[PDB]
C-alpha cells in the first residue's frame, strides 16, 4: 500500500503542473474579441475548460480526504482524466489546417448633426467657465481639466462642443484620440498634423523616434496659446509620456482629457477641483430625447404606451447610448411596434451589436485575475444592492483570491479587488460600512444583461427563473446554481459536481430541494430563507462558506467539528442561544459573525487566524476566557458588549487587547454608568484607525490620556461621550494628524442640569487639518473655535447656541469650504424677542458666506 501512496503523490504533482499550463493557455485565449477567434480554437478552449474543472476536483478530493477505498477511487479517477486529456490532444491535432480590420464604432458619432443633442447648453457653459474663469485667464499658468464616467455617457461629445465653441480665442489646437493599445509615434504624429496641416502635411510618413517628434512639438508651440484635447486615455504610461511635450511654461494654454478610469484623472489634474464628473440626464430630458428620437414630429405619446415607456426609461438609467439604441429598436422606421411587443422587449440588429461591442471594452481590458470576480455578479437579482463583505468572503471561498507572498492577508487582497472594480467605473458604490468602508454596490441593467449572457455561454452560472432562463436544454454538468423563482421544481440527480448553491426566495418551496446529495460543496448560502433546521451540514467535508443569516435555525448539530476547512460562519438573526462545544475544533476559521446574546464555549483561544470577530458576549465569563482572548494575534476587527461583564477585571481585558498588534477597528458598547476599562497607561495598538463608543449614555471621565497624537498617529474616526468637556480638550483633538471624522457628546448637559459653556481655542493655527465633519453635540461656538482660519476642509458643522448669548460674532468667512450647518437653540433663559433676534442674526451670517450653506435651527 506504500506504492499506492507514492504513485498517487506523483500523479497529483503532475496534475498541478498541467493545471498551471492550462490556465496560462485559457487566459491567453480569453483576450481576443469574439470577432477574431476562429471556431476551432473556441471549441477546443471550451473542452479544455471542462477538463480543468475535473482535475481541480480530483486534486481537492485528495487534499481533503488524505484509506484503501479512497486511494482506489482517486487512482481510478486519475487514470480516467489522464486518458481524456490525451484523447482531446490527439483530436485537436487531427483537424488543424493553417490555410481586414474594422473601424472603431465610436468614430461615426463625431459626425452626428448638432441639432440632435438635447441637453448640452448647461454642461457646455459650465465647462467653458471652468476653462476661462475670469477676465485675465489669458495670463495664468497652464491648466488641465479631466472628464470621467462610464461608457456611453457623452464625454467626447461635450468636449467636442466646448472645443468648437471656444477655439477662436487661441492660436493653435488639436483633437486627438488615444485608443486602448496605443502606438506613441502615431499619437505624436496626429498632434503634429492637427496643429498645422500644411507644414507637417506628410508627417505620417517620417521615420524618427519619439525624442525628435517631441522636440518638434516643443519647438512649434513656442510663444503661442494653445487648446488641446486628448481623448480616451486608458492607463498611466501613455499620459506619462505625452506630458513631456507640454513641459515648458506657456501662460494662457489649456488641456482637456477624457477617460473612463479614475486614477488616470487624478494623475492628470493637479487639484481635485479640476475634475468634471459626468452624470446621467434627468428624467424630463431623457423623455424628450426619447420622444424626439421616435415620435419625432408628433412628440405625442399615446396613453397605452405611457407606463411601458416609463419602465423602459427607468431601465435605461439616463445614459444617452442606451436611450438612443432602444429608441431606434422600437422605432422600426417603417412602423411603430405594438404595445404587446413593447412589453416583450421590456421583459427581454446593428445598433444593438454596436452598443454591446462598445460596452465590452471595459471587460476586455481587465487583468486576467479579475474576470471571474466580475462574472460572479451575475448570481444576484436585478435591481437590489449587494453587500461587499458577502462578495469578498464568497470570492475567497470559491478560490479566486490567492498569492504566494508569505505575509499577506487574503481579506485585504479581496478588498483591493473590489476597490479596483469600483475604480474602473463598472460598479456604483453605496453607503458607508460600520468599519469605515463601502457598504454596498449597484450595477447598471444593460451591463447586467451583458454579464449574464457572457457567464451563461460558459456554464459559469445557471439561473432559475420560470418565465425566462429555464434549465439548459442539453447540459449534464452544472457547477453553480442560483434559485430566484421558487415556482420551478429541480431535478438535482444529475448535478453531482455542484460547487455553490444560493436561494433568493422567501418561499417555502425553496427549502424543498434536497441538499445532502451534493457531496462536494464549497458555498452554501441560505440567507433570508425560512429553513428551520439543518442536520445534514455535517457529512459535507468540503464547505468553506456557511451562510445562515435571518433563518429560523434553533440549534446546530454537534458535528460541525468535522469541517476542518471552513473559512466563514455567519449566524445573525437566528434563534440560536448556545453554540456547540465542538466549534472550538475548527482550526482554519477566519470570520465569525454572531449576536451578543449567544454563549460561546470555553476553549476559544485555539481559533487562531481569526481576522474578524463580531459582537462578543462578554457576560458570565471567568478570567481564563479574557486571558485566552489575548492569543488571537492577527485580528483586525473587534466588537464587545460589556453587558453582564463584571467591571473588576478590565485590566486583563485591556492587556489582552494591547497584545493585538494588527488591528483597525474597535467598538465598546456599555449600557450605563462610568466605563471602568481602558485605563490610562494602556499603550493602544499602533495601527488603529477607527474607534467608537456608541453608548451615548455611559460617559468617560475627563478624557483618556492616551489620545495624544504620538500614540495614535493614524486615526480617521472618533465618537466619544464625555462627562464634562473642558476648553483644552478640543486642543488635544487639534493635535491629531488625520482625524477625518469626529463626534463628541457632553453627558452633563442632557442627563444632569449643567448649562452650555462656551469653549475657547487658542495658541495655534492649522488646528484641524483634514476635518471634513464635526458634531459638537452639547457644546457650540463658531468664531472662537476657529481662529486665523483653521480646518480649511470642513463641510458640515453641528453646534448648540443658547439664546442668552444674543449679545461673539457668527462670521462664517474663517472657513471657506462650509456647505452645511445644523444648529439648535436653547430658549428658556432668554425671551422670544432675543430668540428670533438671534435666529435672524445667524441666518444673515449664513447668507453672507459665498458658498451659502444651509441652516437648521431645530
Amino acid at each position: 500500500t506504500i506504492t499506492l501512496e507514492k504513485k498517487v503523490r506523483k500523479g497529483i504533482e503532475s496534475l498541478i503542473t498541467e493545471l498551471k499550463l492550462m490556465q496560462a493557455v485559457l487566459s491567453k485565449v480569453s483576450k481576443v474579441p469574439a470577432d477574431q477567434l476562429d471556431e476551432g480554437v473556441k471549441i477546443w478552449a471550451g473542452n479544455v475548460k471542462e477538463l480543468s474543472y475535473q482535475m481541480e476536483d480530483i486534486v481537492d478530493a485528495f487534499m481533503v480526504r488524505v484509506n484503501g477505498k479512497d486511494l482506489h477511487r482517486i487512482s481510478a479517477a486519475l487514470e480516467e482524466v489522464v486518458l481524456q486529456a490525451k484523447q482531446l490532444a490527439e483530436l485537436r491535432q487531427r483537424y488543424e489546417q493553417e490555410m481586414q480590420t474594422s473601424v472603431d464604432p465610436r468614430m461615426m458619432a463625431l459626425y452626428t448633426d448638432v441639432t440632435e443633442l438635447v441637453g448640452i447648453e448647461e454642461t457646455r457653459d459650465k465647462l467653458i467657465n471652468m476653462l476661462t474663469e475670469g477676465d485675465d485667464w489669458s495670463k495664468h499658468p497652464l491648466k488641465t481639466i479631466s472628464i470621467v464616467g462610464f461608457g456611453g455617457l457623452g464625454k467626447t461629445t461635450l468636449a467636442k462642443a466646448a472645443y468648437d465653441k471656444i477655439k477662436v480665442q487661441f492660436d493653435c489646437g488639436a483633437f486627438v484620440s488615444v485608443s486602448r493599445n496605443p502606438e506613441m509615434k502615431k499619437v505624436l504624429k496626429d498632434i503634429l498634423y492637427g496643429l498645422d496641416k500644411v507644414k507637417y502635411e506628410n508627417i505620417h510618413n517620417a521615420a524618427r523616434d519619439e525624442k525628435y517628434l517631441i522636440d518638434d512639438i516643443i519647438e512649434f508651440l513656442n510663444d503661442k496659446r494653445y487648446l488641446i484635447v486628448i481623448d480616451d486615455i486608458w492607463n498611466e504610461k501613455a499620459w506619462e509620456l505625452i506630458k513631456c511635450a507640454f513641459s515648458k511654461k506657456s501662460p494662457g494654454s489649456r488641456l482637456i482629457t477624457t477617460t473612463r478610469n479614475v486614477s488616470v484623472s487624478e494623475a492628470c489634474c493637479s487639484s481635485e477641483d479640476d475634475i468634471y464628473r459626468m452624470e446621467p440626464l434627468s428624467n424630463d430630458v431623457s423623455r424628450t430625447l426619447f420622444c424626439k428620437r421616435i415620435f419625432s414630429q408628433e412628440e405625442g405619446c399615446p396613453q397605452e404606451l405611457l407606463k411601458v415607456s416609463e419602465e423602459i426609461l427607468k431601465k435605461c438609467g439616463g445614459v444617452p447610448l442606451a436611450i438612443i439604441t432602444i429608441a431606434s429598436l422600437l422605432a422600426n422606421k417603417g412602423h411603430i411596434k405594438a404595445k404587446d411587443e413593447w412589453y416583450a422587449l421590456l421583459s427581454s440588429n446593428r445598433s444593438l451589436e454596436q452598443m454591446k461591442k462598445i460596452l465590452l471594452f471595459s471587460y476586455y481590458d481587465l487583468p486576467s485575475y479579475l474576470k471571474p470576480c466580475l462574472l460572479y455578479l451575475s448570481i444576484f437579482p436585478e435591481d437590489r444592492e449587494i453587500r461587499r463583505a458577502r462578495l469578498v468572503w464568497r470570492w475567497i471561498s470559491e478560490g479566486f483570491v490567492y498569492s504566494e507572498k508569505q505575509d499577506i492577508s487574503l481579506y485585504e487582497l479581496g478588498d483591493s479587488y473590489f476597490n479596483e472594480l469600483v475604480n474602473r467605473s463598472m460598479i456604483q458604490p453605496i453607503g458607508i460600512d460600520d468599519e469605515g468602508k463601502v457598504k454596498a454596490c449597484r450595477v447598471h441593467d444593460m451591463v447586467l444583461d451583458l454579464i449574464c449572457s457572457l457567464s451563461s455561454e460558459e456554464n459559469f452560472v445557471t439561473i432559475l427563473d420560470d418565465p425566462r432562463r429555464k434549465m439548459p436544454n442539453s447540459e449534464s454538468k452544472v457547477r453553480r446554481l442560483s434559485i430566484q423563482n421558487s415556482k420551478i421544481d429541480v431535478d438535482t440527480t444529475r448535478m453531482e459536481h455542484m460547487r455553490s448553491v444560493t436561494v433568493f426566495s422567501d418561499n417555502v418551496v425553496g427549502k424543498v430541494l434536497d441538499i445532502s446529495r451534493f457531496k462536494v460543496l464549497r458555498v452554501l448560502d441560505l440567507e433570508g430563507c425560512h429553513v428551520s433546521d439543518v442536520g445534514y451540514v455535517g457529512n459535507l467535508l468540503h464547505l468553506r462558506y456557511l451562510g445562515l443569516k435571518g433563518t429560523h435555525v434553533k440549534d446546530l448539530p454537534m458535528e460541525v467539528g468535522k469541517l476542518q476547512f471552513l473559512l466563514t460562519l455567519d449566524l445573525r438573526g437566528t434563534k440560536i442561544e448556545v453554540l456547540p462545544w465542538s466549534v472550538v475544533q475548527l482550526r482554519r476559521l477566519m470570520c465569525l459573525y454572531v449576536d451578543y446574546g449567544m454563549k460561546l464555549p470555553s476553549g476559544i483561544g485555539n481559533l487562531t487566524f481569526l481576522e474578524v470577530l463580531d459582537d462578543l458576549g462578554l457576560s458570565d465569563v471567568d478570567l481564563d476566557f479574557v486571558k485566552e482572548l489575548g492569543r488571537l494575534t492577527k485580528l483586525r476587527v473587534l466588537r464587545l458588549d460589556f453587558h453582564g461583564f463584571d467591571q473588576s477585571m478590565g485590566k486583563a481585558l485591556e492587556e489582552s487587547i494591547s497584545n493585538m498588534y494588527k488591528l483597525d477597528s474597535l467598538d465598546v458598547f456599555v449600557n450605563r454608568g462610568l466605563i471602568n476599562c481602558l485605563s490610562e497607561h494602556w499603550v493602544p495598538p499602533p495601527r488603529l484607525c477607527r474607534l467608537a463608543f456608541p453608548s451615548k449614555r455611559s460617559w468617560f471621565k475627563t478624557l483618556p490620556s492616551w489620545i495624544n497624537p504620538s500614540s495614535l498617529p493614524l486615526l480617521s474616526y472618533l465618537d466619544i461621550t464625555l462627562f464634562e468637556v473642558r476648553s483644552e480638550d478640543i486642543q488635544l483633538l487639534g493635535t491629531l494628524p488625520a482625524l477625518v471624522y469626529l463626534e463628541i457628546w457632553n453627558y452633563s448637559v442632557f442627563e444632569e442640569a449643567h448649562e452650555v459653556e462656551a469653549p475657547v481655542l487658542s495658541s495655534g493655527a492649522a488646528l484641524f487639518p483634514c476635518a471634513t465633519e464635526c458634531r459638537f453635540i452639547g457644546i457650540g461656538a463658531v468664531p472662537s473655535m476657529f481662529p486665523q482660519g483653521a480646518a480649511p476642509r470642513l463641510k458640515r458643522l453641528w453646534f448648540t447656541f443658547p439664546a442668552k448669548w444674543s449679545s461673539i460674532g457668527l462670521g462664517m468667512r474663517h472657513l471657506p469650504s462650509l456647505q452645511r450647518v445644523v444648529v439648535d437653540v436653547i430658549s428658556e433663559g432668554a425671551s422670544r424677542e432675543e430668540a428670533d433676534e438671534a435666529e435672524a442674526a445667524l441666518r444673515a451670517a449664513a447668507e453672507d458666506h459665498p458658498n451659502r450653506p444651509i441652516l437648521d435651527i431645530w
Binding site: 429560523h552 438573526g573 453635540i777 439648535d824
Partner: protein, 431 residues
C-alpha cells in the same frame, strides 16, 4: 342578530347617580373611568386616606392568607422545594410591613429580599414567588405614600438598573397570570396593550412610579416603557411567530435615545437609523391594508403605538399621513382597547353578583375573604350597571371613525361585546 347601539347624550342628572355609585361601590373606587373625559360628569368628592388604609388592610389580609397556605403547602409537598425559604421571605415581608423603621434599613432589607428572589419545579411555586415580589413592591408604594420615605431616596431606589429590569417583569407577568384566562374566555385577549396596564386598581401602584419618573427623568420613563413592551412580547402576550425588529436588542434603544435628544438625525440618518425607518414604514404599510390578516394588523398597531407614545414624532412622515389618515385610526383603536378593558372589568364584577361565588374571579389573592364583596343587590346597582354600559357604548360610538378598512379592528369587537353583554346581563339579573 346584532343589538343596536345605545344613543344617549350624557346628562349631569344621571351623571350624579352614576358618579356616587362608582364612588361608593368597592372595585370602582380605586379605578378611574373613561367617562372622566366627558364634558360634565364632574363632582367626584373622593378622599384617598380611607382607600389607603383599606389597601393596608387588604395587603395585611392577603399576606396572612398566603402564609396560611404556605404552612400547609410545606406540610405535604411533592418534592421538597424549600418552602420554608419562601416562608422566611413572607416573614420578613410582614416584619417590614408592620413596624416603622428608619428609611435606610427599609432600603437595605427591601433590596436584599428583592435581589435574592431574583434567582422551575412547580408552577404555583413560581406563582408564590411572583406574588412575593408583587407584595414587596406594593409595600414599597404604600410606604412612599405613607410619607415615611422621601422622593430623593425613592428615585435612588427605583432608577438603579436592576429595579428597572424587575418592574416590567412583574408588571407583565402578574397581569398575565391574573387576567389571561378571563381575557381568553371573554375573547378580547387579542386586544391587550401594555400602555393601558396601569388603569386597573390591581396595578395602581405601578402608575404612581410611572408619573414619578415623568416627575423627574423622562428618559428613564421612556426606557421603562420600551423595556416592558419587549418583556410582554417575550412571554407570549402577542406572538409574532418570527422575530421583533427593534424591541429585544440593546443597540436599538441607543439609537432611539440619540434621535430623541437631537432630532435632526432623522433627516441625515445613519445605517441603523435607516433600517429602523425602513422597518417602520414596512410595518405601517402592513397595518394600513384591510385584507391582510387581523393578528398582523394588531401586532403592527401595538408596536407603532408603543413607539409613538414613548418616542414622539419618530413614526411621522408629513405627506403620506394625510392621504392615509392613520393617526385618527390609531386613536380609535386605542379608545377601543381602553373601553374593552373596562367592559371586561364589568363582566368580571358581575360574578360578584352570583349567589354562590365565594371563589374570587380576579386571581390568586386578589381579594381577601374578610371583605369578599357580597351578593347583596342594592337599590341602585340594577339600574346603574345597565346605565353605565349604555353610557360607555354611547361615549365610544362618537369618536370612532367609520370605514371598512378600519371597521375591521374597532367596530366588530365593540359590536360582539355589546352582543355578549346584552345577552348575559338578564340571565344573571334573574338569579
Amino acid at each position: 342578530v346584532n343589538f343596536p347601539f345605545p344613543k344617549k347624550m350624557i346628562t349631569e342628572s344621571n351623571s350624579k347617580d352614576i358618579r356616587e355609585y362608582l364612588a361608593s361601590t368597592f372595585p370602582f373606587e380605586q379605578q378611574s373611568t373613561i367617562l372622566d373625559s366627558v364634558k360634565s360628569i364632574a363632582k367626584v368628592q373622593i378622599d384617598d386616606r380611607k382607600a389607603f388604609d383599606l389597601q393596608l388592610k387588604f395587603r395585611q389580609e392577603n399576606l396572612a392568607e398566603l402564609k396560611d397556605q404556605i404552612i400547609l403547602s410545606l406540610g405535604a409537598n411533592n418534592g421538597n422545594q424549600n418552602w420554608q425559604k419562601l416562608l422566611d421571605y413572607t416573614n420578613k415581608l410582614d416584619e417590614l410591613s408592620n413596624t416603622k423603621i428608619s428609611p435606610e434599613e427599609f432600603i437595605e432589607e427591601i433590596q436584599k429580599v428583592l435581589y435574592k428572589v431574583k434567582l422551575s419545579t412547580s408552577k404555583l411555586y413560581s406563582q408564590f414567588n411572583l406574588s412575593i415580589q408583587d407584595f414587596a413592591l406594593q409595600i414599597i408604594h404604600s410606604k412612599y405614600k405613607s410619607n415615611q420615605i422621601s422622593q430623593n431616596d425613592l428615585l435612588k431606589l427605583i432608577t438603579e438598573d436592576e429595579m428597572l429590569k424587575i418592574l416590567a417583569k412583574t408588571k407583565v407577568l402578574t397581569y398575565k397570570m391574573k387576567y389571561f384566562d378571563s381575557a381568553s374566555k371573554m375573547g378580547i385577549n387579542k386586544y391587550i396593550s401594555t400602555e393601558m396596564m396601569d388603569l386597573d386598581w390591581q396595578f395602581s401602584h405601578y402608575k404612581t412610579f410611572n408619573d414619578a419618573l415623568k416627575k423627574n427623568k423622562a428618559s428613564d420613563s421612556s426606557y421603562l416603557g420600551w423595556l416592558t413592551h419587549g418583556y410582554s412580547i417575550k412571554y407570549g402576550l402577542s406572538p409574532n411567530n418570527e422575530r421583533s425588529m427593534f424591541f429585544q436588542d440593546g443597540r436599538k434603544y441607543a439609537e432611539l435615545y440619540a434621535f430623541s435628544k437631537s432630532p435632526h438625525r432623522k433627516i441625515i440618518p445613519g445605517e441603523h437609523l435607516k433600517d429602523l425607518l425602513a422597518k417602520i414604514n414596512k410595518s405601517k404599510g402592513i397595518f394600513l391594508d384591510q385584507n391582510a390578516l387581523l393578528d398582523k394588523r394588531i401586532y403592527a398597531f401595538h408596536e407603532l403605538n408603543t413607539l409613538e407614545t414613548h418616542f414622539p414624532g419618530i413614526t411621522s412622515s408629513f405627506t403620506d399621513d394625510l392621504k392615509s389618515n392613520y393617526r385618527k385610526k390609531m386613536e380609535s383603536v386605542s379608545l377601543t382597547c381602553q373601553v374593552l378593558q373596562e367592559i371586561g372589568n364589568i363582566h368580571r364584577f358581575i360574578e360578584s353578583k352570583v349567589p354562590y361565588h365565594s371563589s374570587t374571579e380576579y386571581g390568586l389573592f386578589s381579594i381577601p375573604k374578610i371583605f369578599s364583596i357580597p351578593i347583596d343587590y342594592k337599590h341602585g346597582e340594577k339600574e346603574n350597571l345597565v346605565s353605565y354600559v349604555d353610557f360607555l357604548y354611547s361615549t365610544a360610538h362618537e369618536r370612532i371613525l367609520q370605514d371598512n378598512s378600519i371597521n375591521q379592528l374597532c367596530l366588530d369587537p365593540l359590536q360582539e361585546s355589546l352582543n355578549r353583554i346584552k345577552s348575559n346581563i338578564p340571565v344573571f339579573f334573574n338569579l
